[PDB]
From Swiss-Prot, chain A:
A cellular-component GO term for this protein: host cell nucleus
Name listed for the protein in its UniProt record: RNA-directed RNA polymerase catalytic subunit
Residue ranges, compositional bias (Polar residues): 55-64
Keyword line: Eukaryotic host gene expression shutoff by virus, Eukaryotic host transcription shutoff by virus, Host cytoplasm, Host gene expression shutoff by virus, Host nucleus, Host-virus interaction, Inhibition of host RNA polymerase II by virus, Nucleotide-binding, Nucleotidyltransferase, Phosphoprotein, RNA-directed RNA polymerase, Transferase, Viral RNA replication, Viral transcription
Miscellaneous comment: South Carolina isolate has been sequenced from formalid fixed-lung tissues of a 21-year-old male which died in 1918 at Ft. Jackson, SC. Brevig Mission isolate has been sequenced from lung tissues of an Inuit woman buried in the permafrost in a gravesite near Brevig Mission, Alaska. This sample was recovered by John Hultin, retired pathologist.
Function: RNA-dependent RNA polymerase which is responsible for replication and transcription of virus RNA segments. The transcription of viral mRNAs occurs by a unique mechanism called cap-snatching. 5' methylated caps of cellular mRNAs are cleaved after 10-13 nucleotides by PA. In turn, these short capped RNAs are used as primers by PB1 for transcription of viral mRNAs. During virus replication, PB1 initiates RNA synthesis and copy vRNA into complementary RNA (cRNA) which in turn serves as a template for the production of more vRNAs.
HAMAP family linked: INFV_RDRP (MF_04065)
Family to which this protein belongs: Belongs to the influenza viruses polymerase PB1 family.
InterPro entries: RNA-dir_pol_NSvirus, RNA_pol_PB1_influenza
Molecular function per GO: nucleotide binding; RNA binding; RNA-directed RNA polymerase activity
Location of the RdRp catalytic domain: 268-465
Curated annotation (Swiss-Prot), chain B:
Chain's role: Plays an essential role in transcription initiation and cap-stealing mechanism, in which cellular capped pre-mRNAs are used to generate primers for viral transcription. Recognizes and binds the 7-methylguanosine-containing cap of the target pre-RNA which is subsequently cleaved after 10-13 nucleotides by the viral protein PA. Plays a role in the initiation of the viral genome replication and modulates the activity of the ribonucleoprotein (RNP) complex.
Annotated S-S bridges: none
Subunit-structure text: Influenza RNA polymerase is composed of three subunits: PB1, PB2 and PA. Interacts (via N-terminus) with PB1 (via C-terminus). Interacts with nucleoprotein NP (via N-terminus). Interacts (via N-terminus) with host MAVS (via N-terminus); this interaction inhibits host innate immune response.
One of the protein's GO biological processes: 7-methylguanosine mRNA capping
Molecular-function GO term, any one: RNA binding
Extra remark beyond the main annotation: South Carolina isolate has been sequenced from formalid fixed-lung tissues of a 21-year-old male which died in 1918 at Ft. Jackson, SC. Brevig Mission isolate has been sequenced from lung tissues of an Inuit woman buried in the permafrost in a gravesite near Brevig Mission, Alaska. This sample was recovered by John Hultin, retired pathologist.
Protein name: Polymerase basic protein 2
Swiss-Prot record, chain C:
Assigned keywords, A-Z: Cap snatching, Endonuclease, Eukaryotic host gene expression shutoff by virus, Eukaryotic host transcription shutoff by virus, Host cytoplasm, Host gene expression shutoff by virus, Host nucleus, Host-virus interaction, Hydrolase, Inhibition of host RNA polymerase II by virus, Manganese, Metal-binding, Nuclease, Phosphoprotein
Cofactors that this protein relies on: Mn(2+)
E.C. designation(s): 3.1.-.-
Gene that encodes it: PA
Record-given protein name: Polymerase acidic protein
Function: Plays an essential role in viral RNA transcription and replication by forming the heterotrimeric polymerase complex together with PB1 and PB2 subunits. The complex transcribes viral mRNAs by using a unique mechanism called cap-snatching. It consists in the hijacking and cleavage of host capped pre-mRNAs. These short capped RNAs are then used as primers for viral mRNAs. The PB2 subunit is responsible for the binding of the 5' cap of cellular pre-mRNAs which are subsequently cleaved after 10-13 nucleotides by the PA subunit that carries the endonuclease activity.
Organism in which the protein naturally occurs: Influenza A virus (strain A/Brevig Mission/1/1918 H1N1) (Influenza A virus (strain A/South Carolina/1/1918 H1N1))
Family, per entry: Belongs to the influenza viruses PA family.
Record PTM: Phosphorylated on serines and threonines by host kinases, including human casein kinase II.
Domain of life: Viruses
Motif (Nuclear localization signal 2 (NLS2)): 1-42
Entire-sequence positions represented here: 206 to 716 of 716
Quaternary assembly: Influenza RNA polymerase is composed of three subunits: PB1, PB2 and PA. Interacts (via C-terminus) with PB1 (via N-terminus).
MF annotations from Gene Ontology: endonuclease activity; metal ion binding; RNA binding
Localization, UniProt: Host cytoplasm; Host nucleus
Length: 729, 676, 511
RNA sequence: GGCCUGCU
RNA sequence: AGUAGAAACAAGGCC
């Protein structure tokens, strides 16, 4: 007998066993070297799918830009980025007709947000390409460097702590005849100048990288990261787009998984049960090929201009700016390329900027073709990527266009027996088309395809299929007359998260409890998940039961603690104690569960505030792990782990001292202002001015009614006067 | 005093002087987040790879003067090397366990107060009482449900200001806490945290957890309570229910909500059954709410609602007096009355007998969203004052009062098909049928009532047929008002009788309750109802009803197969097919039933004919009373979301298809049991 | 206000028939729908369409597999060809010093000979493998002489191990301005992997991975005491699961891989410049009840200066076996095979005296591969979860608990592989072990080809299931889907076997 | 031989 | 040699 697990599908349906078709127990595919090749490939593709457009030379950047809007109509079933402005505007008009008042209310909400939002909100983000160092840097690091360089140049409106003032400064930096940046060497610094075009290409450029740990693809794809200048305008645009998508029953992007399933089920119910039995109904469970490549930012600008009609011109401009920057965006090629000489046994790293000048003898025919094709677009080491968006920066607006296309089948606009509706999240859609016969179904799916090609949205025929209503798939959710649990997407989340010991226990038992609630994980599987998680936890953190003979570097202290203690059921798994977790106790932390069994000496040592291990920085990160909210108790096991410590060998050493002393400063401010941690401080007053004035008021109020007598009040006032004098001088 | 000296020391250095001078307060976050350390894309690999090096964790530098460099075995606990961007020192994990075996001690009494929510969860679970596990299909309906169990009904922004007023009274800003609830919360909470020395940030996050509301879409069946959703991983599964009763003393609002929903559902199911009283009693015994049985709450809890009163009266108990009408609760306050057993005609010329009452009498109307006071005479209204909340509430109260008046102005307004027979072929109460007819719109009752003059006393507002106040001429007897509450609350409980069809009565002979007074509304329980019965799909819906009916008949096929042959009338007259009977045309209920019974009879008569698929398909249609006929049917329609889905008698269908290869039956795309 | 440079950029970011942002804004503000979509649809060519091609039983063709030399073993340790020396020592899973346990497990074998080469590597220097074996033996005897066994032993850096572990093989790093006119200076080799055809040995490895054994391989941690009835139900379910699964070679591979990857990661982090000897240990528990320790061989970790998650640490693996390398030589392309001893097993024809070979090879791993193979126990979750789903899906049907009937009465049977006579069905336990072995092999042979093929064949599986349900399914480009599936079948044994399985499934379905 | 780094 | 597969590792830099 030869064993075949796939034959299991001869008795169990494919959706009730789809977890078997998910190889999510092994290393996900990773990239190894440069990502220049994929960046060039994407540039050449997105310039190929729009080649019948019109060419231009930008007067500001000097880059060759391809405009496919209002271009010729496609003649074959290949991908096309030739979107039609009139059709986009008609889609928006019919969208407003079907949901009246949606754009007005969304614009009002976004105006309120624009008026209220602050610059600190840009600190909550991923890596951002800092244009001052030409390096990916954390969002707060990039914001700080940009703010510093602006203040070094005279654009200090951003000190208002409002996002719109930071955007006014970003826009006013381009009308300057010379930027001023600083570069490190070896350790000191050097001043450098940037003419208008250099700063323009630096503000408009995007960084490129390969995306690691992607499940479900044989070949690697590239992704982009924008700078600080485009992130505020994109924040406002994404705010508007979310606000719109919230009011549409056909959008699916701004909502979670469970409400996504609810929406899908409601739509399927509407199309099956309400409609008569005579009509047929077919579900296309489809995807979109090259979704981002064909999404021109000029049609996002047109959509924004339509949405912001009859509105203050300032709001229209602030929301229009982001598409304007994306239309002129540049893409950094990547890391570069490595050359090996086998006879001489040597290697060499060439940067991507040299590709414009480098001889082409050293490249394989594929790279020779890519470089030769892309060289015209290369301006100062970056390729003009105007013809389309890269990897969904405008995700919510793409979902808005998709919901418009889904809303264009209501049967009031088709004016025919067939109609359609569905749910789309960017790059993936499910379409229920209802019609009286198979010719009507074919005509409805042809009109859907064609109306999708007039907006630059291409349907993947290789990865899409149409069946009867009742069975379909949407974002790895398999609906078969009702939704079905998968549990294979959530399998890599069933181990030690890797924050610390307390957080790992909390996150592991909350992930078990959630998978029990949401993904129909069983009771026995949940108990075994507990057991295996605890085994991994003990092995990873060298914290074994203590009645064992496992020799580790931390196996001696655990036995001394085990032997000191009389009540051994009160010890934490992190200190060498038993496991009291079960199904009933998945919603309780490990410190409160064992609290009544603990000894008072151990109980007071563990939960000691003076411990040198617990540090908490901000209210947002106290019990939140990238997002997994995890209820936990602050104990001595809540340490922070160590840092990369690889900056010591690089040109950038002065950031460590700057950040150590900035943390000093922030701690002193927290001493002066107790609520600097809870509520992010707001104001416009300088550090020393606020600190000295606050201290002065405290001394005055203490003298009037408090401990402070004349001596200490006078001393404080004199010292504060000294601080003010030293500040002014 | 120390802090200002620290500030002089920071200001002394020129570089720190430029950091303090240039940085504005708005940027406090940015420089707090300024760090070279990139966030770990793969934290697991970075804590599995990192936990194999000496000194993998970090700690404050005070550890260097509190813990020794090595233990008795000689293993190092900390190093003199510093973290990358910090003054903190690199230490081994042996510094943690050493701290737990030989470090300083304190008093941890503060922590129970600090982490109140978690200890309340522990106390609620420790005292809970489990019971039998019931293996049954779980209809988990995705719904937004409140996760937090101590939420004081304050939003995150709403409660951040109370948290600040409690912990940080000088940094609150312009926000004045107007609401009294916030003000009581502030005074009470301030006392508990007088000296807490954990951290004011942790005390603020504590008050965030206790006070901040939180909602999450979750697949929920039953439950819906704060204390029953925190254990949703333990109470609810895919095929199993776990009876559970948290430890915390339950609020009685939730309990009475569940009591009314349960009583409504039961009363509705009882109306359509064959013997409503027996079924009602058996179901109330076999059902429980929040763990506690239904009888316990019904004997202990006094609650005013029609279904609860019917349930109580069926248990031979006291029941509140002050008869009700059209869902409203009437209390007479003056006069006698006698019925007359008289006859009259309508505006649509239909003849009818009714019982009109004697004497002048005043009444105190009460309701869910309205209130009124009425004075009338024999067949004649005298005056009506109303106290509704919304305009349609006043309209409801006014039409109810007009119907109660029994005036010919109302009798000569009835127009259309108003048949006084129920789904069960039970003649219906006339009064409720009129009151249901005049609830679509009572336009004809308004243009046919009459007109009188008014003295314009008190500055009272005029009446509205269609939102037209008339301050000098108005409906006759009818007034406009808006009281806060009815005259006074009635609490005098009476003895009653009940017919089989739940027509409650009083000692004199008048009518007191009926299954028509119960609401037509469909609510969502706050506590998990454990309506234990073979049929739990009472309110589930038609698709579930069909699938589960076919599943039941599959599971109990072994005894239905022998009851179908011997004594089949108690199989047709069975308490399991009544939800299916709720479906299937109301007119062709009898024709379909007789058809199917004749099929089964001629299938039993001739030998050599037996198809289990036919019986399992057509049995739910033979439940109804048999109406004879001469025709035949090729399909059978069933109402699903207003659409008539057709079930094919011969062969498979989208509603009923039995695979002959794998022997699985499938209802509506859902498996409904293997067939033998 | 928009002004200056950002106005000009605004004028060059509009459709092509516009020259000013203000004219475009006026056109939009005056735009009113007047039937434009329908018109451009009428102008659009009718060749651009999405005609639905029906999908019937005769429509789907088999998946084509590549042609080429047969595929060779890729795993980091032997799966079915592995051998165990044992001492029967009462020491729990980790309660020992690996090197002392290894010495005890090696002392119990007598029959050692002078090693000689049997199957050469054919690309390497087999005398170096011979010398490396002899060095390992010398160092083990040296450890034996020492009064206290080192917890971690380093190895000498001889030329055989410098070669066998890839030492001073990386090229030197220079500046591009110093190597330009070099003849053979070119880009890294970036070509299609070498093609490889499916072989018969992977199916036999999978057949034996699904087999029972005479020992227990999983001792789980403890949990709280069960207080609710559903906890008792879950505990009985878990006991049945562990009973069925604990006697299975898949769990043995789980433990081997977890131990080996833990040891490799820890040795790599702790000793980065030194070479280190790491015994292959696994502690089972025979059905009688005595616990046993088992040694499969040795690893020799090279240096491990691993920066990126893809950086490679090289090691030399040596494993004992009884399988002759001359019966399936294409399976051992990357292996050198020596002859190391003789063994007399339990025979009824006197004693057999079969020889005993050592499979020696150079291999490598990364931080991520180590991390992901040290967590193969999640496979037990995947499998058992699917099983539990099935059980609960049946318990809802029959209003009663279904663990005992399923696991004991064995009445239910699921097709779980085809015999020459036809499709063969198995009991719930065989299904459990089959899914566990599938997940374990997914973990051992994980590659981007597996991901790609899994997705692209999931799509076809779902289309075939829609066809099986009589839901009149259809497609728009099926040959593209096939070309996307077949694009991932290149050289991986596991992926080619999955493709063969999919072909067999399509053959047995659609009837 | 000694020291710096292990995502920069 | 080996890992690996559209580009990399098989240590890197500073004295």
């Amino acid at each position: 007998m030869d064993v075949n697990p796939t034959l299991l599908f001869l008795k169990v349906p494919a959706q009730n066993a789809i977890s078997t078709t998910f190889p999510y127990t092994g290393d996900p595919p990773y990239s190894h070297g440069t990502g220049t090749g994929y960046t060039m490939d994407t540039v050449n593709r997105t310039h190929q799918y729009s080649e019948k457009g019109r060419w231009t030379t930008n007067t500001e950047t000097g880059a060759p830009q391809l405009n496919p809007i209002d271009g010729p109509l496609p003649e074959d079933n290949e991908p096309s980025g030739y979107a039609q402005t009139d059709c986009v505007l008609e889609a928006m008009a019919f969208l407003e007709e079907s949901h009246p008042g949606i754009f007005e209310n969304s614009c009002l909400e976004t105006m309120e947000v624009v008026q209220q939002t602050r610059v600190d909100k840009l600190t909550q983000g991923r890596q951002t390409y800092d244009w001052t160092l030409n390096r990916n840097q954390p969002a707060a690091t990039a914001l700080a460097n940009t703010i510093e360089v602006f203040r070094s140049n005279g654009l200090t409106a951003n000190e208002s702590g409002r996002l719109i003032d930071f955007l006014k400064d970003v826009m006013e930096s381009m009308d300057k005849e010379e930027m001023e940046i600083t570069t490190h060497f070896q350790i000191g610094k050097k001043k450098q100048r940037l003419n208008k075009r250099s700063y323009l290409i630096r503000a408009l450029t995007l960084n490129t990288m390969t995306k690691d740990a992607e499940r479900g693809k044989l070949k690697r794809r590239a992704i982009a990261t924008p700078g600080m200048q485009i992130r505020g305008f994109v924040y406002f645009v994404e705010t508007l787009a979310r606000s719109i998508c919230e009011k549409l029953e056909q959008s699916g992007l701004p909502v979670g998984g469970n409400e996504k399933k609810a929406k899908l089920a409601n739509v399927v119910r509407k199309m099956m049960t309400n409609s008569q039995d005579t009509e047929l109904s077919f579900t296309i469970t489809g995807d979109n090929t090259k979704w981002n490549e064909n999404q021109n930012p000029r049609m996002f600008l047109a959509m924004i201009t339509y949405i912001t009609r009859n509105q203050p011109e300032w709001f229209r401009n602030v929301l229009s700016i982001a598409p304007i920057m994306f239309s002129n965006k540049m893409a950094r090629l990547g890391k570069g390329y490595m050359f090996e000489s086998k006879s001489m046994k040597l290697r060499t790293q060439i940067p991507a900027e040299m590709l414009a000048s480098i001889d082409l003898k050293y490249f394989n025919d594929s790279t020779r073709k890519k470089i030769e094709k892309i060289r015209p677009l290369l301006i100062d080491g970056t390729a003009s990527l105007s013809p389309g968006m890269m990897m969904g920066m405008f995700n919510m607006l793409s979902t808005v266009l998709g919901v418009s296309i889904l809303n264009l089948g209501q049967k009031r606009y088709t004016k025919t027996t067939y109609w359609w509706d569905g749910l789309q999240s960017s790059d993936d859609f499910a379409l229920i088309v209802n019609a009286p016969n198979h010719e009507g179904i074919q005509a409805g799916v042809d009109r859907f395809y064609r109306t999708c090609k007039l907006l630059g949205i291409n349907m993947s025929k290789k990865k899409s299929y149409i069946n009867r209503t009742g069975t379909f798939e949407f974002t790895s959710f398999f609906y078969r007359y009702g939704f079905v649990a998968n549990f294979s997407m959530e399998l890599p989340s069933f181990g030690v998260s890797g924050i610390n010991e307390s957080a790992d226990m909390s996150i592991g038992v909350t992930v078990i409890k959630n998978n029990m609630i949401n993904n129909d994980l069983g009771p026995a599987t949940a108990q075994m998940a507990l057991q295996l998680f605890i085994k991994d936890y003990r092995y990873t953190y060298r914290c074994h039961r203590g009645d064992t003979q496992i020799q580790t570097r931390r196996s001696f202290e655990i036995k001394k603690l085990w032997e000191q203690t009389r009540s051994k059921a009160g010890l934490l798994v992190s200190d060498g104690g038993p496991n009291l977790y079960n199904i009933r106790n998945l919603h309780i932390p490990e410190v409160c569960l064992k609290w009544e069994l603990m000894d008072e000496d151990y109980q007071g040592r563990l939960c000691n505030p003076l411990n040198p291990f617990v540090s908490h920085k901000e209210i947002e990160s106290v019990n939140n792990a990238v997002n997994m909210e995890y209820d936990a108790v602050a104990t001595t096991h809540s340490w922070i782990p160590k840092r990369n410590r690889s900056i010591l060998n690089t040109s950038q050493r002065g950031i460590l001292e700057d950040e150590q002393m900035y943390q000093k400063c922030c701690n002193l401010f927290e001493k002066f202002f107790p609520s600097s941690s809870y509520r992010r401080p707001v104001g416009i007053s300088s550090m020393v001015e606020a600190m000295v004035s606050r201290a002065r008021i405290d001394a005055r109020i203490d003298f009037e009614s408090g401990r402070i007598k004349k001596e200490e009040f006078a001393e404080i006032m004199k010292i504060c006067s000294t601080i003010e004098e030293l500040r002014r001088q | 005093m120390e802090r200002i000296k620290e500030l002089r020391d920071l200001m002394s250095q020129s570089r720190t002087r430029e950091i303090l001078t240039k940085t504005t307060v708005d940027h406090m976050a940015i420089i707090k987040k300024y760090t070279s350390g990139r966030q770990e894309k793969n934290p697991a690999l970075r804590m599995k790879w990192m936990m194999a090096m000496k000194y993998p964790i970090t700690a404050d530098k005070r550890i260097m003067e509190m813990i020794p460099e090595r233990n008795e075995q000689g293993q190092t606990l900390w190093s003199k090397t510093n973290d990358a961007g910090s003054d903190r020192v690199m230490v081994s994990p042996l510094a943690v366990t050493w701290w737990n075996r030989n470090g300083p001690t304190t008093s941890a009494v503060h922590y129970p107060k600090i982490y109140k929510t978690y200890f309340e969860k522990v106390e609620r679970l420790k005292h809970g009482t489990f019971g039998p596990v019931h293996f049954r299909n779980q209809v988990k309906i995705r719904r937004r449900v409140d996760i937090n169990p101590g939420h004081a009904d304050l939003s995150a922004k709403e409660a951040q200001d109370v948290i600040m007023e409690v912990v940080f009274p000088n940094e609150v800003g312009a926000r004045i806490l107007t609401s009294e609830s916030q003000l009581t919360i502030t005074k009470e909470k301030k006392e508990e945290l007088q000296d807490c020395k954990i951290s004011p940030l942790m005390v603020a996050y504590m008050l965030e957890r206790e006070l901040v509301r939180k909602t999450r879409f979750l697949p929920v069946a039953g439950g819906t309570s704060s204390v029953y959703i925190e254990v949703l991983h333990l109470t609810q599964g895919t095929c199993w229910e776990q009876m559970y009763t948290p430890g915390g003393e339950v609020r009685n609002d939730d309990v009475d909500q569940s009591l009314i929903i349960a009583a409504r559902n039961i009363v509705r199911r009882a109306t359509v059954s064959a013997d409503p009283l027996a079924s009602l009693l058996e179901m109330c015994h076999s059902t429980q709410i929040g763990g506690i049985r239904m009888v316990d709450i019904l004997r202990q809890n006094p609650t005013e609602e029609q279904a609860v009163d019917i349930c109580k009266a069926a248990m031979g108990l006291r029941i509140s007096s002050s008869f009700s009408f059209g869902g409203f609760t009437f209390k007479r306050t003056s006069g006698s009355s006698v019925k007359r057993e008289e006859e009259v005609l309508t505006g649509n010329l239909q003849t009818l007998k009714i019982r009109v009452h004697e004497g002048y009498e005043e009444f105190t109307m009460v309701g869910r969203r309205a209130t009124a006071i009425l004075r009338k005479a024999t067949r004649r209204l005298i005056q009506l004052i109303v106290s509704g909340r919304d305009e349609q509430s006043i309209a409801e109260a006014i039409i109810v009062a007009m119907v109660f008046s029994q005036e010919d102005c109302m009798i000569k307004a009835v127009r259309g098909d108003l048949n006084f027979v129920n789904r069960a072929n039970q003649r219906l109460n006339p009064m409720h049928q009129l009151l249901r007819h005049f609830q679509k719109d009572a336009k004809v009752l308004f243009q046919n009532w009459g007109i009188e003059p008014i003295d314009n006393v008190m500055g009272m507002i005029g009446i509205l047929p269609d939102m037209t106040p008339s301050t000098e001429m108005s409906m006759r007897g009818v007034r406009v008002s808006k009281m806060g509450v009815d005259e006074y609350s009635s609490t005098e409980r009476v003895v009653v009788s009940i017919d089989r069809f739940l027509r409650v009565r009083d000692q004199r002979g008048n009518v007191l309750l009926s299954p028509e007074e119960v609401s037509e509304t469909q609510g969502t329980e706050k506590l998990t109802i454990t309506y234990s019965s073979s049929m739990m799909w009472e309110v589930n819906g038609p698709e579930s009803v069909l699938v589960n009916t076919y599943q039941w008949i599959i599971r109990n096929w072994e005894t239905v197969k022998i009851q179908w042959s011997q004594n089949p009338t108690m199989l047709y007259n069975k308490m399991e097919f009544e939800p299916f009977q709720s479906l299937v045309p109301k007119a062709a209920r009898g024709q379909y039933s007789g058809f199917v019974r004749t099929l089964f009879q001629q299938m039993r008569d001739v030998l050599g004919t037996f198809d289990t698929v036919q019986i399992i398909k057509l049995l739910p249609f033979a439940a109804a009373p048999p109406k004879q006929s001469r025709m035949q049917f090729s399909s059978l329609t069933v109402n699903v979301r207003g659409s008539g889905m057709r079930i094919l008698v011969r062969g498979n269908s989208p509603v009923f298809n039995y695979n002959k290869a794998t022997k699985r039956l499938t209802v509506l795309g859902k498996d409904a049991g293997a067939l033998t | 206000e928009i002004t200056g440079t950002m106005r000009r950029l605004a004028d060059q970011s509009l459709p092509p028939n516009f020259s000013s942002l203000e004219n475009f804004r006026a056109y939009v503000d005056g735009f009113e729908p007047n039937g434009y979509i329908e018109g451009k649809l009428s102008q659009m060519s009718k060749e651009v369409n999405a005609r639905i091609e029906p999908f019937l039983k005769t429509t789907p063709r088999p998946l084509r597999l590549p042609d080429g030399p047969p595929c060779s073993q890729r795993s980091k340790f032997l799966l079915m060809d592995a051998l165990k020396l044992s001492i029967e020592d009462p020491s729990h899973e980790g309660e020992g010093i690996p090197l002392y346990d290894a010495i005890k497990c090696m002392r119990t074998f007598f029959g050692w000979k002078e090693p000689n080469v049997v199957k050469p590597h054919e690309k390497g220097i087999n005398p170096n493998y011979l010398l490396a074996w002899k060095q390992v033996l010398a160092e083990l005897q040296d450890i034996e002489n020492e009064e206290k066994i080192p917890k971690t032993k380093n190895m000498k850096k001889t030329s055989q191990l410098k070669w066998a572990l890839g030492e001073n093989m990386a090229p030197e790093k220079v500046d591009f301005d110093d190597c330009k006119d070099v003849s053979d200076l070119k880009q890294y080799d970036s070509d299609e992997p070498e093609l490889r055809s499916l072989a018969s040995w992977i199916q036999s490895e999978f057949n034996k991975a699904c087999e029972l054994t005479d020992s227990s391989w999983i001792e789980l941690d403890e949990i709280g005491e069960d207080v609710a009835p559903i906890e008792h139900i879950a505990s009985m379910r878990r006991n049945y699961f562990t009973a069925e699964v604990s006697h299975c070679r898949a769990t043995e591979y789980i433990m081997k891989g977890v131990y080996i990857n833990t040891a490799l990661l820890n040795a790599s982090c702790a000793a980065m410049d030194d070479f280190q000897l790491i015994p292959m240990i696994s502690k089972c528990r025979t059905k009688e009840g005595r616990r046993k320790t088992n040694l499969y061989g040795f690893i020799i970790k090279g240096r491990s200066h691993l920066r990126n998650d893809t950086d490679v640490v090289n090691f030399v693996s040596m494993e004992f076996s009884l399988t002759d390398p001359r019966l399936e030589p294409h399976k051992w392309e990357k292996y050198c095979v020596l002859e190391i001893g003789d063994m007399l097993l339990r025979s009824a024809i006197g004693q057999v005296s079969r020889p005993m070979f050592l499979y020696v090879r150079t291999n490598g791993t990364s931080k991520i591969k180590m991390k992901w193979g040290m967590e193969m126990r999640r496979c037990l979750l995947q499998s058992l979860q699917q099983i539990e789903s099935m059980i609960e899906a049946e318990s809802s049907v029959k209003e009663k608990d279904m663990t005992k009937e399923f696991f004991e009465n064995k009445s239910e049977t699921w097709p779980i592989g085809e015999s020459p006579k036809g499709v063969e069905e198995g009991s719930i336990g065989k299904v459990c072990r089959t899914l566990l072995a599938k997940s374990v092999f997914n973990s051992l042979y994980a590659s981007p080809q597996l991901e790609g093929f899994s997705a692209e064949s999931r799509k076809l599986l779902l289309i075939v299931q829609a066809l099986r349900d009589n839901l009149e399914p259809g497609t728009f480009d099926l040959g593209g889907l096939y070309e996307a599936i077949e694009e991932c079948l290149i050289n991986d044994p596991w992926v080619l076997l999955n493709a063969s399985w999919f072909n067999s499934f399509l053959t047995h379905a659609l009837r």
